[PDB]
Amino acid sequence: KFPVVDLSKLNGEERDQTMALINEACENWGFFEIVNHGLPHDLMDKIEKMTKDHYKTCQEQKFNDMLKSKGLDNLETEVEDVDWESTFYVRHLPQSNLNDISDVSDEYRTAMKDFGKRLENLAEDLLDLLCENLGLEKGYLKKVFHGTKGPTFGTKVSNYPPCPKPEMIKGLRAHTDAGGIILLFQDDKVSGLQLLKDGDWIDVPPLNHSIVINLGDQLEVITNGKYKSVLHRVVTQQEGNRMSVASFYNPGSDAEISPATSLVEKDSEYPSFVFDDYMKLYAGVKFQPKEPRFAAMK
Amino acid sequence: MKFPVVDLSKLNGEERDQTMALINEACENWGFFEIVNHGLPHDLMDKIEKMTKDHYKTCQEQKFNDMLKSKGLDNLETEVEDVDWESTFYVRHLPQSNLNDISDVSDEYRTAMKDFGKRLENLAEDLLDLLCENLGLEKGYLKKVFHGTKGPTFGTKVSNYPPCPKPEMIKGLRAHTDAGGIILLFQDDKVSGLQLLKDGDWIDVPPLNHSIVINLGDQLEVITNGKYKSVLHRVVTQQEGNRMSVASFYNPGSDAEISPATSLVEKDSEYPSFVFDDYMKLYAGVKFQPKEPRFAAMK
Amino acid sequence: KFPVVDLSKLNGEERDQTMALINEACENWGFFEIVNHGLPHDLMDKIEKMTKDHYKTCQEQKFNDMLKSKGLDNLETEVEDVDWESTFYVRHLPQSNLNDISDVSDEYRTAMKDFGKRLENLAEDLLDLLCENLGLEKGYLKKVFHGTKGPTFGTKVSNYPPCPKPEMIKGLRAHTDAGGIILLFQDDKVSGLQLLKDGDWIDVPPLNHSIVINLGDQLEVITNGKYKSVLHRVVTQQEGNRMSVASFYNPGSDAEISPATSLVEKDSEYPSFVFDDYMKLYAGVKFQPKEPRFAAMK
Amino acid sequence: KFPVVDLSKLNGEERDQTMALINEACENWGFFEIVNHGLPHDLMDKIEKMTKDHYKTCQEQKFNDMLKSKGLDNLETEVEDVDWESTFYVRHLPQSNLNDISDVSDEYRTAMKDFGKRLENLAEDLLDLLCENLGLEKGYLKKVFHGTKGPTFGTKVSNYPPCPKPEMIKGLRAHTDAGGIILLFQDDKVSGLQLLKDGDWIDVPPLNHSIVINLGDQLEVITNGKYKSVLHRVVTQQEGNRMSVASFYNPGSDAEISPATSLVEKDSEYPSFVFDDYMKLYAGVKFQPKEPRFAAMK
Ligand SMILES: O=C(O)c1ccccn1
Ligand SMILES: O=C(O)c1ccccn1
Ligand SMILES: O=C(O)c1ccccn1
Ligand SMILES: O=C(O)c1ccccn1
Ligand SMILES: [Zn+2]
Ligand SMILES: [Zn+2]
Ligand SMILES: [Zn+2]
Ligand SMILES: [Zn+2]
């Protein structure tokens, strides 16, 4: 059963049990859903509606332009080198480009700014729960992530349109995320996101007004492997356009990333590096195995 | 943390148990090991090496340079992670040989390759029997699983990794695990390059004169229920030196049924049961992506 | 000005003028277009439509698989030994293989059979006009071409898909045709076929519901050089997929080919041979000079 | 310091810094000189000699004729509506008139033809360097310039003879060039060409065996203002006849010119139009401000 965490149970004497659920999702799933997370359901509903309307208005034509430009009109053999995906990226931190994206509406930009700020505070709240579960001092992960200019925080807004031949192409090929903590607002009707657990692909179930959390490669390093970043993918379907609004809380470019000493006894197998060196490498090898990227930092 | 070198002549004597134990440790903890004092005549190895290197210089080097310019890798500017800096051709031995159909090979190279391949096929089957004994399986178990209808698949990849002006930019061969059963490598004894991933570090598979490098593929990880894992490996380039590689792949037949051996399965396995050719059709397209999704895809 | 022959003008006031124009194209161009040729325009439209749809369904992915098979994905330097071409061949005579091309529909097969029979009749009508212009007896060329089983007649169905760098590769390299008379139904929008005349490449202009005629090597022999087989090529372009349905009316395999004695005063420089010996040679040297093939038949 | 670019440094490890100099000149100067290009110094020396000898034999007459019919022999006060200039034009593409200029010698025409071909290839190589610096796809600008008949390429051969009172008249009044890329072989002793930069007229220094490059109005549109076409003029002097051999690589007449979409964020201030409409208008208003010509294309 996929972990669903009720964050409102942290405000009372059920808080220890909630923390234990968070910790075991972090150790064994790499993913969990959160409900009662404090984000207004009214804000999620308009983010959802304006994301979908901005797709028809602005992204659908770019998407078909892409399928023509790569011959994906007609899928007669398996395509393992492209994602059946429509995306644009919004940067929040350290410097916002929200007011420079030309094709987004005023009210969409205002909703995205509010949504991004609330998710940034929720990311930092979640990192503190991780710290507590890890036996780290409060604020430890936030301070590691800061670097010189503060954390990097952006939002990937994706749609995975219907695919006539889902067997032939993935919406997004299997990978682990490079960063710190990932907070996903996904479609509540159209499924597609899957994680790999114990040798099976497991669906990340659509759930109304929920946020999906998962941990990236940097948290595997800092926890000395105690919390691993898990492989995940998006599969297409013939009917349905799955919406994806995923926010990435990453260390600053010059943050020093290393295994926390209190989590290391035997010499660590994980490297110590500067985050931007990891991200330069990751961009070119995102869909290749994760383990060579750690070795490359030594 | 020393790379395992196994003396196969010590299986013939009082030290056979200690030698078997060493083999089993390499299979569990390295996925690779070198063997010495195997049956292969050192003069046949010297001939194979000599004729491979001369066939590169004579027939492949001009094609390799032409491939460079056709792809614009003659001048390297930024990292290339979708191309291998590699010159290769393939020789199929089983189930059906294509040796007499490679046009650009000499009669003496073709005859030596046929002889070399036959000896390596017999050595592959002897090594599979050592694994069976170490795993507690009946003798011939892995050979029988691999047979399918037409027998095992056996072929040889003959590769050269020529000097690369900028090695930090392109791999000789990107990191992957091998799809098949057991892989037997005769590699350059001077020029290094092959590396395996162990405990979060890339480790050189050291060139060693008249040795054979053994490693296990994805099919043995399934059959042993994860006890022997298929290990990630790559070939790095260098500015000088052309590393030769003659690698033989002993794989199950196309219609072989692959599954975890029942005596190694005390609770539900995380590994699938499938037909080998379905794994291979999938593997061809995703060879340089993670291994674990390929097992999940067989369920 | 590229010769366009109006076959309705044989009926016949300008019939001398039309015949003189046919003769002038045969001597000096080796190519000419015909209009009002009797082929139903609706049959041409069906052939064109089903040819273009059959490419998309059956050849376009085969074509992209061939490109990556041969490395023409990257055209960083000149390719002089490959044609940027998708083709299949249909034999009508003496023995049809129309029923063995498996990925074609019964409607396409029935239309090609009707089209091929009408083009075979037009080929023989055209050969009789050449006979008259040359002063040969009616039916002379048809009788020479017959051999024992009748003429050889087949259709090459080609498409020349768009090429990102057309200056690196030809759709089809310069050559002369080996056979008798060639009747080409080409794309009426996308140009590409060129002939060599007076040291210049001249486009063979797309013209709706027209047939392009050219003379092959066998007619150069029979006419003792009075009508020469002209070099031609197909150039690629970056946008546009030029279709080509080209039918070859050739002598039978065991036909005896020699210069017609009434066209020879001074001893001929052209050989006398059996057609299949010419064709067995031509296959290996099609894109090398034409003149050594005549010498090789002595 | 006026930018001088060594093109031979593109073949090696200094190529990035060379590209950076090119991009800097394109953004901030609109002009740059190139050395070590492909043109043989003996071809430049012969072009220069035969241009100067062609002035004395053929153009000096037409020039004094011009001064007659305009009353410019004596300059009592400023002349702001005529250029103190002797010119004839050579067209290369899409069609050459080189063999139709009556008063040009055989060897001048052969040199002029070889010179023009090398400058046409150098124009296209330079346009690809701009593409790379702009982040556009390789060949982007050449493809935009093509239209139906290919680029327009011609050569303006000018002399600016000595002027008794240079204060009264310009050799060529201040203007921006209408076209794409301009490649100038100018006098290496007699100066005169100036550009306007940061509120100062700056001399374009004569330099042995160099080519002066500048960008026209069409590249400002395509780059959405990132590379502007800058005002330039030729001043006269009392002693010295400055030679000017200027080749203009322009889009084809029916080319569609618009800001490249990857260079546009907010709505562009530049129009989208067909090049020949710009040229019709430019011809009549060449020495008036540039900005109204862009406004006129909307
Ligand atoms: O696009 C991704 O990589 C993604 C999106 C949401 C959650 C995890 N990963
Ligand atoms: O080419 C390979 O994948 C290979 C070759 C030799 C040994 C292991 N792997
Ligand atoms: O494919 C050919 O060689 C051909 C096709 C049409 C017309 C002339 N020649
Ligand atoms: O005559 C011109 O307008 C010109 C000549 C050379 C360079 C720039 N402009
Ligand atoms: Zn992800
Ligand atoms: Zn391998
Ligand atoms: Zn032909
Ligand atoms: Zn100018």
The residue written with tokens 């114990």 in the block is: A198
Q: Tell me how far CA of residue B168 lies from CA of A205, B77, C61, in angstroms.
A: 42, 11, 36
Phi then psi for residue C35, to 5 deg, are -120, 160
Q: Tokens 């792809």: give the residue.
A: B71
CA D116 – CA D259 distance, rounded (Å): 29
Q: Which member of A80, A196, A285 has the closest CB to residue B81?
A: A285
Q: Which residues pair with D211 in a beta bridge?
A: D34
DSSP class per residue in A224-293: TTSSPPPPEEEE--SS--EEEEEEEEE--TT-EE---GGG-SS--SS--EEHHHHHHHHHHSTTS-SHHH
How many Å lie between the centroid of ligand 6 and the Cα of residue B176? Answer: 6
Strand locations in chain C, DSSP E?
A: 4-6, 31-35, 86-93, 152-160, 170-175, 181-186, 193-197, 200-203, 211-215, 232-235, 242-250, 256-257, 273-274
Please state the separation of Cα D24 from the chain's center in Å. Answer: 19
Question: Is the distance from CB of C245 to CB of C59 less than 8 angstroms?
Answer: no
Q: Three-class SS string for B118-135?
A: HHHHHHHHHHHHHHHHHH
Tokens of A171: 């919406």
The dihedral sign for the CA sequence B157, B160, B165, B168: positive
Ligand 3 shell residues, CB under 6 Å: C 156, 172, 177, 182, 184, 214, 232, 244, 246
Min CA distance, A240 vs chain D (Å)? Answer: 30
* 8 Å CB contact between C238 and C197: no
Does the beta-carbon distance from B197 to A233 stay under 8 Å? no
Q: Residue A58 phi/psi, 5° resolution?
A: -125, -35
| Chain A residues with beta carbon closer than 8 angstroms to that of C61 | 74, 76-77
Residue A267 in contact with partner chain D when CB distance is under 8 A: no
Give one DSSP letter per residue of C27-47, joined into a string. Answer: HHTSEEEEES-S--HHHHHHH
Please, which residues have CB within 8 angstroms of residue A293's CB and are 6 or more apart in sequence? A217, A278, A281, A282, A285
Label the pairing between strands A170-175 and A232-235: antiparallel
A149 DSSP 8-state letter: T
Write out the two tokens for C241: 């997929």
Which residue from A minimizes the CA distance to C63? A71
Which residue's CA is minimally distant from atom 5 of ligand 2? Answer: B247
Longest C-alpha distance within chain A, in Å? 58
Kindly state the tokens that stand for C270.
């052209």
Contact flag B72-C71 (C-beta cutoff 8 Å): no
What does C60-108 look like in DSSP terms, one character per residue?
Answer: HHHHHHHHHHHTTT--SS---S-B--EEEEEEEESS--GGG-TTS-HHH
Distance (Å, whole) CA A62 – CA D244: 47
- Which residue ranges have their beta carbon within 6 Å of ligand 2? B 157, 173, 178, 183, 185, 215, 233, 245, 247
- Give the H or E element holding residue B215: strand B212-216
Q: How far apart are CA B154 and CA B257, in angstroms?
A: 17
Q: Which two tokens stand for residue B72?
A: 């614009």
- H-run or E-run covering B284: helix B276-285
- Measured distance CA(D238)–CA(D160) in Å, rounded: 11
Q: Is residue C176 within 8 Å of residue C290, measured between CB atoms? A: yes
Residue with tokens 């040359």: C134
CB B294 within 8 A of CB B218: yes
What's the gap in Å between A174 CA and the centre of ligand 5? Answer: 8
Beta bridge partners of B185: B213, B247
Q: Give yes or no for A99 touching D (CB within 8 A).
A: no
In sequence order, what are the beta bridge partners of B36?
B7
Distance in angstroms (rounded) separating the CA atoms of residues B230 and B180: 9
Annotate A62-124 with DSSP letters as a single string: HHHHHHHHTTTTS--S-B-SS---EEEEEEEESS--GGG-TTS-HHHHHHHHHHHHHHHHHHH
- Give the count of beta carbons closer than 10 Å to the beta carbon of residue B58: 12
The gap from C-alpha B196 to its chain's centroid, in whole angstroms, comes to 12
CATH number at residue C111: 2.60.120.330
The technique is X-ray
Structure tokens at B73: 């890798």
| Mutation for B interface: A281, A285, A286, most B CBs within 10 A | A285
Closest C-alpha to ligand 2, atom 4:
B247
Taken as a whole, chain A contains a residue count of 298
Domain extent, residue C297, equals 1-298
Chain A residue numbers touching D267 (CB-CB < 8 A):
102
- Cβ–Cβ of A77/C60 closer than 8 Å? no
Q: How many domains does chain A have?
A: 1
Residue D102 CA to residue D104 CA, distance in Å, equals 6
Please enumerate in sequence order all residues whose Cβ is within 8 A of that of A11, keeping only pairs 6 or more positions apart, or say none.
none
Q: How many helices (H) and strands (E) does chain D have?
A: 8, 13
Candidates D32, D20, D7; CA nearest to D197 is: D32
Alpha-carbon torsion angle B63, B69, B75, B80, nearest 10: -80
Helices then strands, each counted (H, E), chain A: 8, 13
- Look up tokens 């991009």; give the residue: D23
Given resolution (angstroms): 2.1
Beta bridge partners of B234: B195
B212-216 and B32-36 beta bridge pairing: antiparallel
How far apart are the C-alpha atoms of B272 and B259, rounded to whole Å? Answer: 6
Any CB–CB contact under 8 A between A225 and chain B?
A: no
Both tokens assigned to C233: 């090529």
Take residue C109 and report the two structure tokens written for it.
């097969």
Contact partners, residue D82, CB within 8 Å, separation at least 6: D70, D72, D169
Is the C-alpha dihedral spanning C40, C45, C47, C50 positive or negative?
A: negative
Q: What are the structure tokens assigned to A129, written together? A: 């729960």
Angle at D31 between CA D27 and CA D35, to 5 degrees: 120
Q: Which residue of A has its CA nearest to B231?
A: A291
A140/A127 Cα distance (integer angstroms): 9
User: What is the DSSP code (8-state) at residue B67?
Assistant: H
Short-list A151, A172, A178, A158, CA closest to A293: A178
- Rounded to the nearest 10 degrees, what angle do helices D15-28 and D106-134 cross at? 90
> What single string gives the DSSP state of each residue in D236-263?
--SS--EEEEEEEEE--TT-EE---GGG
Name residue A153's beta-bridge partners: A93, A249
Annotated binding site of C for Fe cation: 175, 177, 232
φ/ψ of residue D196, rounded to 5? -95, 120
Kindly list the residues from chain C whose CB atom is less than 8 angstroms away from the CB atom of residue B72. Answer: 74, 76
Q: D229 and D177 in contact (C-beta within 8 Å)?
A: yes
Gap between the Cα atoms of D91 and A225, Å rounded: 71
